[PDB]
């Protein structure tokens, strides 16, 4: 590639984008691993849900499973009202770059 000008930090930006995310992900581990988080996780808790299904949609925990080994949380999570019924319109789309 040619980076002379507007693209000068393009490779370094990538590193900055990845490592920063990694730090939060490490921080994210440093979030559930704490005994204090393990105290907060109960009914009456609002959480940000991050997976392929929910993209940082706000959800509120209803209960925490008594079996704390496989922690499955029956949790009310907002999602878009489904304006579809057919799986055929879903196809791979643009890779969301991490913006600032």
């Amino acid at each position: 590639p040619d980076m002379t000008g507007q693209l000068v930090d393009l490779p370094e930006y990538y590193s900055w984008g990845e490592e920063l995310t990694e730090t939060q992900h490490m921080i994210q581990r440093r979030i559930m691993e704490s005994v204090n988080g393990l105290k907060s996780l109960s009914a009456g808790r609002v959480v940000v849900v991050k997976n392929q299904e929910h993209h940082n949609a706000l959800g509120v925990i209803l209960q925490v499973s008594s079996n704390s080994t496989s922690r499955v949380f029956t949790t009310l999570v907002l999602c878009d009202k489904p304006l579809s019924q057919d799986p055929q319109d879903r196809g791979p789309a643009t890779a969301e770059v991490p913006y600032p």
């Binding site: 990538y14 939060q24 440093r30 890779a95």
Partner: protein, 100 residues
């Protein structure tokens, strides 16, 4: 880690590539090449020589051998080494007793 994350967020929020016309393509292509490079490095290391679990112990054995008068620099056996080579048991102690 949290302060480093804060600094990375601050630096990322001023990037010039984010305003460039060709930000997504070059960037994703760089992602692909970098991922391949990292897996390439791990792959070559797996076939490399540091993988051997006991290599530090081999180095330590050579060092203890060389602190006594048994192996020259760069691993060439000296006379005490050839005496302690053809010995049944307690080679170190027996040859040390013999030379003294």
């Amino acid at each position: 880690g949290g302060l480093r994350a804060r600094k990375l967020e601050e630096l990322i929020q001023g990037a010039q590539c984010v305003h460039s016309p060709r930000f997504p393509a070059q960037y994703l292509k760089l992602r692909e090449r970098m991922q391949i490079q990292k897996e390439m490095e791990r792959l070559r290391f797996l076939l490399s020589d540091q993988s051997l679990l006991l290599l530090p112990e081999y180095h330590q054995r050579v060092e203890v051998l060389r602190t006594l008068g048994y192996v020259d620099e760069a691993g060439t056996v000296k006379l005490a080494g050839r005496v302690a080579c053809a010995m049944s048991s307690h080679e170190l102690l027996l040859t040390e007793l013999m030379f003294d």
